[PDB]
Ligand binder design. Structure first.
Ligand code: IJI
Ligand code: CL
Length: 130
């Protein structure tokens, strides 16, 4: 129905706003763009599903997220990709990991404070109906 379509539009608006707030945060610059194969040619071989915040915006716009849970899977993938690709004790890897955990924790905290649980539940029920 049009009211279901309005629901998903509201979801996209909400997700774009959360993703913009993450993308403008200086700590999260490394997560804003896909990794350049030049810098890092083994990236695309180690990490089987790369994900970054510009890809997340593209997916919102392509209507790939019908629930906040589905969007959070992608935030979680940005984080887990960084933990897996940079697992060493050296400062460069520890800084990326700390920033990745911070991305994840920040996205979850914004959603906890600003997503209405009944709105998520509505999205879930429409999704489940299709
Ligand atoms: C789960 C993500 C949380 N953050 C981190 O990864 C950071 C940075 C890596 C250092 N320690 C190891 N991870 N071994 N660690 C903290 C909080 O000290
Ligand atoms: Cl830096």
């Amino acid at each position: 129905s049009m009211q279901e379509e309005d629901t998903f539009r509201e979801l996209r608006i909400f997700l774009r706003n959360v993703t913009h707030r993450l993308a403008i945060d200086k700590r999260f610059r490394v997560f804003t763009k896909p990794v350049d194969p030049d810098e890092v040619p083994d990236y695309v071989t180690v990490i089987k599903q790369p994900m970054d915040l510009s890809s997340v915006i593209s997916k919102i716009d392509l209507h790939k997220y019908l629930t906040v849970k589905d969007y959070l899977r992608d935030i979680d993938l940005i984080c887990s990709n960084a933990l897996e690709y940079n697992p060493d004790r050296d400062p460069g890897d520890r800084l990326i990991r700390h920033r990745a955990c911070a991305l994840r924790d920040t996205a979850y905290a914004i959603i906890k404070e600003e997503l209405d649980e009944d709105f998520e539940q509505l999205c879930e029920e429409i999704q489940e109906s299709r």
